[PDB]
Amino acid sequence: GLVLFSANSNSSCMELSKKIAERLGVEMGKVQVYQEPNRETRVQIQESVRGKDVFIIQTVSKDVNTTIMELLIMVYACKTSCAKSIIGVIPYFPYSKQSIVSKLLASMMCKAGLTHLITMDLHQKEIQGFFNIPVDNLRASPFLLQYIQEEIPDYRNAVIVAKSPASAKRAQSFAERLRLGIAVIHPITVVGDVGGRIAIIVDDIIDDVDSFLAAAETLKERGAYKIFVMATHGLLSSDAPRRIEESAIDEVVVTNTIPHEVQKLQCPKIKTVDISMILSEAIRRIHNGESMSYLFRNIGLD
Amino acid sequence: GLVLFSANSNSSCMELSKKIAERLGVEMGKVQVYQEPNRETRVQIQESVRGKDVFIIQTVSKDVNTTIMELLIMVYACKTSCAKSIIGVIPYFPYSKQSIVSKLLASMMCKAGLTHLITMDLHQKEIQGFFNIPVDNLRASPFLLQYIQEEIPDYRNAVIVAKSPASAKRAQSFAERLRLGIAVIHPITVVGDVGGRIAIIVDDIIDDVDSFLAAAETLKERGAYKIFVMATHGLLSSDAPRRIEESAIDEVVVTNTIPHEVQKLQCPKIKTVDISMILSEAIRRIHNGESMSYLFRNIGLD
Amino acid sequence: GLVLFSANSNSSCMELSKKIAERLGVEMGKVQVYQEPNRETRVQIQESVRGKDVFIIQTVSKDVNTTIMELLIMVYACKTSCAKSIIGVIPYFPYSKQSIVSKLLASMMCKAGLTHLITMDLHQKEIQGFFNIPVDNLRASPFLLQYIQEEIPDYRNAVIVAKSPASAKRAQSFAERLRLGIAVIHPITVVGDVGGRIAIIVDDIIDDVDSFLAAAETLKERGAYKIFVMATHGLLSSDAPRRIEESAIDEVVVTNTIPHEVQKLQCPKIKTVDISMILSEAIRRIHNGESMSYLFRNIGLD
Amino acid sequence: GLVLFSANSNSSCMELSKKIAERLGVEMGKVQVYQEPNRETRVQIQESVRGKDVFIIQTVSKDVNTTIMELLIMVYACKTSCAKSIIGVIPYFPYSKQSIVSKLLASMMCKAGLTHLITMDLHQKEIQGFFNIPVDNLRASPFLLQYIQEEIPDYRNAVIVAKSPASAKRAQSFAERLRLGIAVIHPITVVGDVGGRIAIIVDDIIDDVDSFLAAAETLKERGAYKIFVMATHGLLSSDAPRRIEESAIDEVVVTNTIPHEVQKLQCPKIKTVDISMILSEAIRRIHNGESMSYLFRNIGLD
Amino acid sequence: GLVLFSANSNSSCMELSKKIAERLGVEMGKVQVYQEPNRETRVQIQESVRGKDVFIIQTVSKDVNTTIMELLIMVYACKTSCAKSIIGVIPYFPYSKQSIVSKLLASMMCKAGLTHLITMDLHQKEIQGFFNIPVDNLRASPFLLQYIQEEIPDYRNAVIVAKSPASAKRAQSFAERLRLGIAVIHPITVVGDVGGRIAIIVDDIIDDVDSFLAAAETLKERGAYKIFVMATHGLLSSDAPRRIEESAIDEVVVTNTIPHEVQKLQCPKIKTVDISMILSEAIRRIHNGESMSYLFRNIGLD
Amino acid sequence: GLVLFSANSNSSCMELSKKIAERLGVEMGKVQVYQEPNRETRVQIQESVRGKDVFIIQTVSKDVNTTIMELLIMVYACKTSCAKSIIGVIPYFPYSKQSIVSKLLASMMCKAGLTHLITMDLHQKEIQGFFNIPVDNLRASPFLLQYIQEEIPDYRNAVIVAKSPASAKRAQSFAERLRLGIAVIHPITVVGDVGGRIAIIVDDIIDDVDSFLAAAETLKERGAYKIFVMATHGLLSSDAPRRIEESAIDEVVVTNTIPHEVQKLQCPKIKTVDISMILSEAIRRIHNGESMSYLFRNIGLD
Ligand SMILES: [Cl-]
Ligand SMILES: [Cl-]
Ligand SMILES: [Cl-]
Ligand SMILES: [Cl-]
Ligand SMILES: [Cl-]
Ligand SMILES: [Cl-]
Ligand SMILES: [Cl-]
Ligand SMILES: [Cl-]
Ligand SMILES: [Cl-]
Ligand SMILES: [Cl-]
Ligand SMILES: [Cl-]
Ligand SMILES: [Cl-]
Q: Between chain C and chain D, are at least 3 CB pairs below 8 A? A: no
Largest pairwise CA distance in chain A: 62
Q: What length does chain B have? A: 302
| Chain A residues whose beta carbon lies within 8 Å of the beta carbon of residue D79 | 134
Ligand 10 centroid – CA E204 distance (Å): 7
Cβ–Cβ contacts within 10 Å for residue C214, how many?
17
Would an 8 Å CB–CB cutoff place B123 in contact with chain C?
no
Would an 8 Å CB–CB cutoff place F38 in contact with chain E?
yes
One domain for residues D233 and D105: no
| Chain D residues whose beta carbon lies within 8 Å of the beta carbon of residue B63 | 39, 65
How many CA atoms does the CB half-sphere of C34 hold within 13 Å? 5
Question: Minimum-distance ligand to the CA of A129?
Answer: 3
Ligand 10 centroid – CA E120 distance (Å): 7
Phi, psi torsion values for D86, nearest 5 degrees = -125, 100
Check C50 against B116: CB less than 8 A apart. Answer: no
**DSSP 3-state assignment of B215?**
helix
**DSSP 3-state assignment of B237?**
coil
Task: State which residue of chain D sits closest to B60, comparing Cα positions.
Answer: D38
Task: State which residue of chain D sits closest to B108, comparing Cα positions.
Answer: D108
Determine the straight-line distance between the first and last CA of chain D, rounded to whole angstroms.
28
The answer for residues whose C-beta is within 8 angstroms of residue F161's C-beta and 6 or more apart is: F171, F182, F183, F184, F185, F192, F194, F199, F200, F201, F202, F215, F219
One domain for residues C220 and C168: yes
DSSP A165: G
Give the CA angle between residues E35, E39, E44 to the nearest 5°.
30
How many contacts (CB atoms, under 8 Å) link B and D? 86
Q: Method of determination?
A: X-ray
Question: Minimum-distance ligand to the CA of E257?
Answer: 10
Q: Between chain E and chain A, are at least 3 CB pairs below 8 A? A: no
H helix runs in F81-161, sequence order? 101-111, 141-151
DSSP string, D76-135: HHHHHTT-SEEEEE-SS-SS-----HHHHHHHHHHHTT--EEEEES-SSGGGGGGSSS-E
| Chain D residues whose beta carbon lies within 8 Å of the beta carbon of residue E182 | 165, 186, 191
Helix or strand (DSSP H, E) at F162: strand F158-162
One domain for residues C88 and C67: yes
Q: Is residue E73 within 8 Å of residue E43, measured between CB atoms?
A: yes
Check B134 against C51: CB less than 8 A apart. Answer: no
One domain for residues F282 and F134: yes
Q: Is residue D195 part of a domain?
A: yes
Phi, psi torsion values for A291, nearest 5 degrees = -70, 165
Phi-psi region of F164 (alpha: psi -120 to 50; beta: other; left: phi over 0): beta
Window 225-244 of E: residues touching F by CB (8 A cutoff) are 235, 237-238
Nearest to E134 among B47, B48, B82 (CB): B82
Nearest to A51 among F289, F292, F293 (CB): F289
CA distance C101 to chain B (A): 25
Q: Is residue E301 part of a domain?
A: no
One domain for residues F27 and F135: yes
How many contacts (CB atoms, under 8 Å) link C and F? 72
In sign, the C-alpha dihedral spanning B113, B118, B122, B128 is: positive
One domain for residues A146 and A220: yes
Would an 8 Å CB–CB cutoff place D104 in contact with chain A?
no
Resolution for this model in angstroms, one decimal place?
Answer: 2.5
One domain for residues F96 and F160: no
Task: State which residue of chain A sits closest to F132, comparing Cα positions.
Answer: A80
Give the CA angle between residues A288, A293, A297 to the nearest 5°.
95
Task: State which residue of chain E sits closest to D137, comparing Cα positions.
Answer: E99
Nearest to C80 among B134, B291, B293 (CB): B134
Helix or strand (DSSP H, E) at E217: helix E210-221
Q: Is residue E31 within 8 Å of residue E45, measured between CB atoms?
A: yes
Identity at C236, one-letter amino acid code:
L
- In the sheet that B226-234 helps form, which strands lie side by side, from edge to edge? B190-191, B181-185, B158-162, B198-206, B226-234, B251-255, B270-273
Q: Is residue B247 part of a domain?
A: yes
Nearest to A41 by CA among B249, E209, C67, D50: C67
H helix runs in chain D, sequence order? 15-24, 64-80, 101-111, 141-151, 168-177, 210-221, 240-246, 261-265, 276-288
| Chain B residues whose beta carbon lies within 8 Å of the beta carbon of residue E289 | 50-52
Would an 8 Å CB–CB cutoff place B134 in contact with chain A?
no
Q: Do you find a cis peptide bond into E138, omega within 30 degrees of 0? A: no
- Residues B281 and B296: their CA atoms lie apart, in Å, by 9
CA distance F264 to chain C (A): 33
Q: Is residue D148 within 8 Å of residue D116, measured between CB atoms?
A: no
Cβ–Cβ contacts within 10 Å for residue C217, how many?
15
Dihedral in degrees, nearest 10, Cα atoms B6, B11, B15, B19? 70
Phi, psi torsion values for F285, nearest 5 degrees = -65, -45
Which protein residues have their CB within 5 A of the ion that is ligand 2?
A: A 121, 139-141
Q: Is residue D301 part of a domain?
A: no
Check D38 against B64: CB less than 8 A apart. Answer: yes
Phi, psi torsion values for E239, nearest 5 degrees = -90, 30
DSSP string, C231-251: EEEE---TTHHHHHHHSS--E
Give the CA angle between residues D33, D38, D42 to the nearest 5°.
20
Total domains, chain B: 2
- Residues E240 and E228: their CA atoms lie apart, in Å, by 15
- Residues E129 and D144: their CA atoms lie apart, in Å, by 31
Phi-psi region of A121 (alpha: psi -120 to 50; beta: other; left: phi over 0): left
Q: Is residue A112 within 8 Å of residue A75, measured between CB atoms?
A: yes
One domain for residues C175 and C284: no
One domain for residues F121 and F5: yes
Q: Is residue D234 within 8 Å of residue D255, measured between CB atoms?
A: yes
Ligand 3 centroid – CA B129 distance (Å): 15
- Residues E98 and E182: their CA atoms lie apart, in Å, by 26
- Residues A190 and A197: their CA atoms lie apart, in Å, by 14
Q: Is residue E299 part of a domain?
A: no
- Residues E254 and E204: their CA atoms lie apart, in Å, by 9
Task: State which residue of chain F sits closest to C128, comparing Cα positions.
Answer: F100
| Chain A residues whose beta carbon lies within 8 Å of the beta carbon of residue B103 | 129
Residue D257 CA to its chain's centroid (Å):
3
CA distance D231 to chain E (A): 18
Ligand 12 centroid – CA F279 distance (Å): 13
Residue E108 belongs to domain with CATH number:
3.40.50.2020
CA distance A108 to chain D (A): 19
Ligand 12 centroid – CA C226 distance (Å): 38
Check D291 against F80: CB less than 8 A apart. Answer: no
Q: Where are the beta strands (DSSP E) in chain E?
A: 3-6, 31-35, 41-45, 53-57, 85-89, 116-120, 135-138, 158-162, 181-185, 190-191, 198-206, 226-234, 251-255, 270-273
Q: Is residue A206 part of a domain?
A: yes
Choose, out of F104, F109, F110, F238, the residue to mutate when testing the contact with E (most E CBs < 10 Å).
F104
Cβ–Cβ contacts within 10 Å for residue B174, how many?
21
Largest pairwise CA distance in chain C: 62
Q: Is residue A167 within 8 Å of residue A147, measured between CB atoms?
A: no
- Residues B3 and B31: their CA atoms lie apart, in Å, by 11
Nearest to E291 among B50, B79, B80 (CB): B50
The answer for residues whose C-beta is within 8 angstroms of residue D22's C-beta and 6 or more apart is: none
Task: State which residue of chain A sits closest to C80, comparing Cα positions.
Answer: A99
Phi-psi region of B95 (alpha: psi -120 to 50; beta: other; left: phi over 0): left
- Residues F40 and E60: their CA atoms lie apart, in Å, by 11
One domain for residues B28 and B177: no
One domain for residues A159 and A226: yes
Task: State which residue of chain E sits closest to B46, comparing Cα positions.
Answer: E293
| Chain B residues whose beta carbon lies within 8 Å of the beta carbon of residue A126 | 100, 124, 126-127, 129-130
Ligand 11 centroid – CA D70 distance (Å): 53
- Residues E122 and A61: their CA atoms lie apart, in Å, by 60
Q: Which structural domain, as residue segments, surrounds residue B162?
A: 140-273
Check D82 against A290: CB less than 8 A apart. Answer: no
Choose, out of E30, E46, E48, the residue to mutate when testing the contact with C (most C CBs < 10 Å).
E48
Question: Minimum-distance ligand to the CA of F204?
Answer: 12
Q: Is residue A301 part of a domain?
A: no
Nearest to F291 among A48, A79, A80 (CB): A48
Q: Is residue A58 part of a domain?
A: yes
One domain for residues E106 and E167: no
